[PDB]
Each structure stands twice: as structure tokens, then as C-alpha cells.
Amino acid sequence: FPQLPPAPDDYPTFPDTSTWPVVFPELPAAPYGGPCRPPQHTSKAAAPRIPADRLPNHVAIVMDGNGRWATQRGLARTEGHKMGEAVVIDIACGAIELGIKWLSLYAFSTENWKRSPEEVRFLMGFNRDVVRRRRDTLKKLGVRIRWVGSRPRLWRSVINELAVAEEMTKSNDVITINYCVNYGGRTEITEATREIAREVAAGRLNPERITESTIARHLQRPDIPDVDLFLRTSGEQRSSNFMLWQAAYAEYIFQDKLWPDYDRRDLWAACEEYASRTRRFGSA
Amino acid sequence: FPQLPPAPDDYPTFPDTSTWPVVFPELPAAPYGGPCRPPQHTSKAAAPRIPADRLPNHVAIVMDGNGRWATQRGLARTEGHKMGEAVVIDIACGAIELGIKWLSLYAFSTENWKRSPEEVRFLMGFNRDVVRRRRDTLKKLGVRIRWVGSRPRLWRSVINELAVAEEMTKSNDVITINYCVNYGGRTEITEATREIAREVAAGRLNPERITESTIARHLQRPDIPDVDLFLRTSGEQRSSNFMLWQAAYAEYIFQDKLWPDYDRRDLWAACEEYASRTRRFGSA
Numbered sequence: 103f104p105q106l107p108p109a110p111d112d113y114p115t116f117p118d119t120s121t122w123p124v125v126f127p128e129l130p131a132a133p134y135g136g137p138c139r140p141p142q143h144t145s146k147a148a149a150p151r152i153p154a155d156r157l158p159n160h161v162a163i164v165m166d167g168n169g170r171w172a173t174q175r176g177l178a179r180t181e182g183h184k185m186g187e188a189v190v191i192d193i194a195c196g197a198i199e200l201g202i203k204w205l206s207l208y209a210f211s212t213e214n215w216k217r218s219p220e221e222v223r224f225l226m227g228f229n230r231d232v233v234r235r236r237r238d239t240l241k242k243l244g245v246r247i248r249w250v251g252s253r254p255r256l257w258r259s260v261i262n263e264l265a266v267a268e269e270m271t272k273s274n275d276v277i278t279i280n281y282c283v284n285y286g287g288r289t290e291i292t293e294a295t296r297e298i299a300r301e302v303a304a305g306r307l308n309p310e311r312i313t314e315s316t317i318a319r320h321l322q323r324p325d326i327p328d329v330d331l332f333l334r335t336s337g338e339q340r341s342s343n344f345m346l347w348q349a350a351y352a353e354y355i356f357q358d359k360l361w362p363d364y365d366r367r368d369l370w371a372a373c374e375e376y377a378s379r380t381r382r383f384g385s386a
Numbered sequence: 387f388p389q390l391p392p393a394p395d396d397y398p399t400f401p402d403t404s405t406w407p408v409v410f411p412e413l414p415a416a417p418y419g420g421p422c423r424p425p426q427h428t429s430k431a432a433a434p435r436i437p438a439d440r441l442p443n444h445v446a447i448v449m450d451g452n453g454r455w456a457t458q459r460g461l462a463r464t465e466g467h468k469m470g471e472a473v474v475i476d477i478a479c480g481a482i483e484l485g486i487k488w489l490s491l492y493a494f495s496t497e498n499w500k501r502s503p504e505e506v507r508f509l510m511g512f513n514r515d516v517v518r519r520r521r522d523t524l525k526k527l528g529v530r531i532r533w534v535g536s537r538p539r540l541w542r543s544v545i546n547e548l549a550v551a552e553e554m555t556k557s558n559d560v561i562t563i564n565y566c567v568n569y570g571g572r573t574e575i576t577e578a579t580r581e582i583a584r585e586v587a588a589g590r591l592n593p594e595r596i597t598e599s600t601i602a603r604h605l606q607r608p609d610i611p612d613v614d615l616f617l618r619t620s621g622e623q624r625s626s627n628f629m630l631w632q633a634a635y636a637e638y639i640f641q642d643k644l645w646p647d648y649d650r651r652d653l654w655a656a657c658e659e660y661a662s663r664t665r666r667f668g669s670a
């Protein structure tokens with residue numbers, strides 16, 4: 103509707119935070135078919151009945167509040183980032199249940215190089231490890247995942263683990279996740295402009311025929327549709343250069359809770375809020 | 387502090403909406419030097435005291451709610467637009483009293499062509515008329531005003547009035563107002579890329595030396611600073627393609643009030659909220 107019908111009471115749940123990393127549970131097959139039904143949330147709550155025409159096609163999430171969450175508990179920054187991993191997969195599962203087809207996640211920004219070298223080194227190694235550790239699960243779920251971001255300075259290991267994940271999941275179609283690492287909206291537009299410039303220098307493009315579509319086709323990932331719902335947690339009301347081209351007409355929802363406390367029910371609440379919003383795209 | 391002191395109690399007030407267009411009051415002579423103090427608000431409220439370093443340098447406003455405002459009163463949508471003129475000038479006045487250096491106003495977007503022919507026709511002539519009617523006053527307040535927008539489809543008469551306003555006020559420095567008509571963020575970025583492409587074709591630019599700053603330098607108005615505070619009235623929570631490149635890192639404040647009900651005290655309220663907040667890591 104296009105939601106998955108409620109899960110059988112006994113269907114496996116997620117996340118069990120009794121251990122870290124959180125062990126993603128074994129799922130029954132349910133053939134003949136392809137993708138496994140994502141695990142139900144711990145609370146066993148069901149996705150709300152949102153009609154196709156009022157559901158966001160593409161949700162972009164700026165995950166925020168990890169450091170504050172850690173500090174509330176006298177913990178190292180790193181421990182809040184670690185708690186955020188389960189939340190990503192939880193939101194993936196909820197996204198699928200609700201029927202969201204595109205999901206962009208701001209895993210690491212071009213501005214995040216301004217953090218301490220210790221934290222940046224953790225975040226790089228952490229993203230590398232998360233993709234390696236979760237990509238098999240994501241594939242089973244019918245998730246198509248791939249890297250979106252800028253090449254310079256990004257660890258080759260992180261690009262390489264995502265390329266592997268991209269190849270493994272290239273024919274999946276339940277949901278697409280743009281895993282944005284070393285991503286910058288201005289930077290992505292700039293890279294598109296560089297490509298365009300090269301074609302002009304090569305005599306292959308008339309400057310006068312450059313249109314908005316020219317820019318869109320030359321973005322790293324030209325198939326990414328416009329952002330309908332732009333979410334950011336921790337109550338910070340800033341887009342921070344995320345999905346800059348794509349989100350020009352996005353609806354913003356700013357939720358107060360810190361990312362490690364976030365779960366799929368909060369995503370669902372944001373989508374209900376989106377459902378009530380009226381979008382005009384400049385029309386009367 | 388960069389605020390103007392509270393105005394003399396007997397200093398002219400603005401706006402009186404008992405006439406349309408509203409009458410801009412005669413102001414006492416400057417002995418001199420140049421720029422005259424703006425009329426104070428009808429309420430005689432004074433701008434809040436905010437250190438120059440904690441103000442937003444650049445405030446962008448999406449003026450919204452004119453149509454709903456008219457509809458509440460059983461009036462044609464264009465009657466709401468008419469009321470917006472006074473609010474623009476009142477906010478200009480209030481921005482000067484607060485010490486704001488940069489103000490961008492979204493007067494008509496590249497997507498507003500989707501509206502009815504009668505509303506578009508009105509908005510074009512209305513913007514033309516407002517600039518002609520208010521140009522001399524803005525000049526005497528020390529406002530530097532100029533057009534920001536895309537040329538195709540925009541009435542030449544609107545461009546022409548703003549050209550005269552730009553020339554008359556090019557040496558002013560109290561506040562800069564970007565008067566954005568037929569403005570579209572994606573379209574402005576595209577125009578810059580076309581500019582870059584032309585330079586590349588002429589050999590005056592190396593495509594491998596193109597950076598984010600190359601794009602910035604090729605925007606229509608390259609001197610526009612980053613938007614610090616992005617405001618939108620009417621309860622809508624979206625940027626709608628306004629100051630797209632420039633507002634990458636903006637803080638958003640959404641105010642529920644309809645534009646014709648807005649006044650300079652509301653601008654002050656948002657700026658004080660912006661200013662008083664602790665500027666956390668990852669915010670300039």
C-alpha cells in the first residue's frame with residue numbers, strides 16, 4: 103500500500119543491543135522469491151498506512167547527535183558513533199517496511215576533516231568496517247547500496263569496500279541507499295562542472311547548450327532523484343551541504359532526538375509529518 | 387554594538403497601511419553626513435542589542451503566505467501581494483536598525499511561472515513598480531540594492547528599473563539588498579557553469595584548475611556572502627531553490643506568520659535566536 107503487511111508475531115526482531123556489534127538475526131527464506139523480509143523492530147510496531155502519493159520517494163538523513171549522546175554518559179565520542187551503526191540498519195529495515203525507494207545517508211562530510219585526526223581516523227576505519235560487516239545482510243534484503251562522495255583524501259579502503267558492496271547489490275531493487283562518504287554538495291556540483299569543462303576543452307560540448315539537465319547528467323550518480331523529505335536529528339536546523347543539488351525543493355523535518363536514541367518508529371513519524379505537508383514547486 | 391540607538395520618540399514611524407501604496411514618511415534632514423535614519427516601527431520598538439560578531443552577516447528571506455492571507459479575508463491573491471510591499475520596506479528598515487549587512491529577498495522564482503497568467507503578469511508589473519517607487523528612499527537610507535536572477539522570460543522592465551536602482555546605489559554601504567526576481571538556485575549554478583565553459587573554450591581557464599571557488603567567482607553576483615540565517619514565513623519548511631549555492635551551511639528558522647502580518651520585530655526575534663545560541667563546533 104506500498105507498505106509490507108505487519109510481521110508475524112514470531113518474526114525475528116532488530117536491534118538487540120545486548121552486544122556490540124549488534125548481531126543481525128538469521129531470517130527465514132520464504133521462497134519462491136528473492137529478498138528476505140526485514141526483521142521487525144524490537145517493539146514489534148507496524149509501519150503506518152501511508153498512501154503511495156503521499157509517501158516520500160527519496161528520504162535524505164543527516165545523522166547527528168552522536169557526540170552529545172556519548173557526553174551525556176561520560177563516554178568517549180567513539181562510543182556514540184558505534185551506537186549509531188545499529189540505528190542505520192534499523193532505519194534501512196523501517197524504510198523498506200514503509201516503502202521508501204531511495205535513502206541517502208550522510209555518513210561523512212567533506213567538512214568532517216575539521217574534526218580531530220583521532221576521530222577522523224576512527225570514522226574512516228569505522229565506515230570501512232561497517233560496509234564490510236553489513237553488505238551481505240543488505241544484499242539479502244534487496245538493498246542496492248553504493249558510495250556517493252568525493253575521491254580526494256577519502257581512504258581507498260572505504261571506496262573499495264563500497265565498490266564491492268555496489269557490485270554485489272547492483273541488481274537489487276527493493277530500495278537504493280546512497281552511502282555518502284566524503285560527500286559535499288558544492289563539491290559534487292564542482293566535479294560535474296569539471297567533467298563539463300573537459301568535454302568543452304575536447305571540442306565535444308557547446309557551452310551554449312549547457313542546461314540544468316547537463317549538470318544533473320554529469321553528477322557522480324545521475325540516477326539519484328530529487329529529495330522529497332530531508333531529515334536531520336538532534337534538533338539542528340541546517341542542511342550542511344547535503345544533497346545540495348537534489349534537495350532544492352525538499353521538505354525539511356528537524357527531529358530533536360540524538361541519533362543513537364533514534365529508531366525506525368521515528369522515521370515513520372517524520373514520514374507521517376511529510377504526508378500532511380502540501381508541496382507546490384512554485385505553483386499557486 | 388552595531389545597532390542604531392532607539393529612535394527619537396518623535397521620529398517618523400513606518401508602515402501606515404491605511405493607504406495603498408503605503409506612504410513613506412518625510413524624514414528629518416541629515417546635517418549631514420549621508421544616510422538618513424530609517425523610520426522607526428509603528429510600535430516604536432527598538433532593535434535588540436546584539437554584538438556585531440554574533441549577528442548573522444547575511445539573512446535570506448523567503449517571503450510567503452500572501453495568498454493565504456488574502457484568502458482568509460475573501461480577497462484576490464494579488465491583494466496579499468500588494469500588502470507585501472510595506473513589509474519588505476519595514477524589514478529593510480529593521481535590518482538597518484539591527485546592523486545586518488546583507489539581506490536577500492525572494493521576490494519571484496524561476497518556478498513561479500507555473501502560476502496563472504494573471505498572477506504572473508501582476509507580479510512582474512508589481513516588482514517593476516515597487517523598485518521604481520522605493521529606489522530613491524532605499525538610496526537615502528544607504529541601501530545598496532541590485533537584481534539577482536535569470537534573464538530569460540523576466541520582463542525587461544523589471545530588469546531596467548533594478549539597473550537604475552543598482553547604478554544609483556552602487557556606492558552605498560549601510561546594507562546590501564539582493565532583490566531576487568526570476569531567481570532559481572539551480573539555474574544560477576547552471577549560468578555559472580556556462581560562464582566557466584565559455585572561458586574554457588577561449589582557453590582562459592584550465593578545467594583541471596576548477597575549484598568550488600571557481601564556481602563562486604562565476605555566479606551572477608560573486609560578492610554575495612554565504613547565507614548565515616535563512617528565514618521563511620507561513621509555516622512552510624522548505625528552501626524552494628533559494629540561494630542554493632550560498633545557503634549550503636545556513637541555519638533555518640521557520641516562522642508561522644503570513645508575510646503580510648510580518649514586521650521588523652519578527653526579523654529581530656529570529657536574529658536574536660540565531661545570535662544567542664551557543665555556536666557549536668561545525669558552525670561559523
Ligand SMILES: CC(C)=CCC/C(C)=C/COP(=O)(O)OP(=O)(O)O
Pocket residue numbers: 386449450451452453454455467470471474492493494495620
Ligand atoms: C513582497 C513580494 C515581492 C512578494 C512576493 C513573494 C511571492 C513568492 C509570493 C509569496 O506568497 P504566496 O503567493 O506563495 O502565498 P501562499 O503560499 O499563501 O499562496
Ligand SMILES: CC(C)=CCC/C(C)=C\COP(=O)(O)OP(=O)(O)O
Pocket residue numbers: 165166167168169170171182183184186187208209210211214228229336361
Ligand atoms: C557512521 C556514523 C555513526 C555517522 C554519524 C554521522 C557523523 C558524521 C557524526 C554525527 O554526530 P556528531 O558527531 O556530529 O554528534 P554531535 O553533534 O552531538 O557531536
Ligand SMILES: [Mg+2]
Pocket residue numbers: 166167168668
Ligand atoms: Mg553534529
Ligand SMILES: [Mg+2]
Pocket residue numbers: 450451
Ligand atoms: Mg507560497
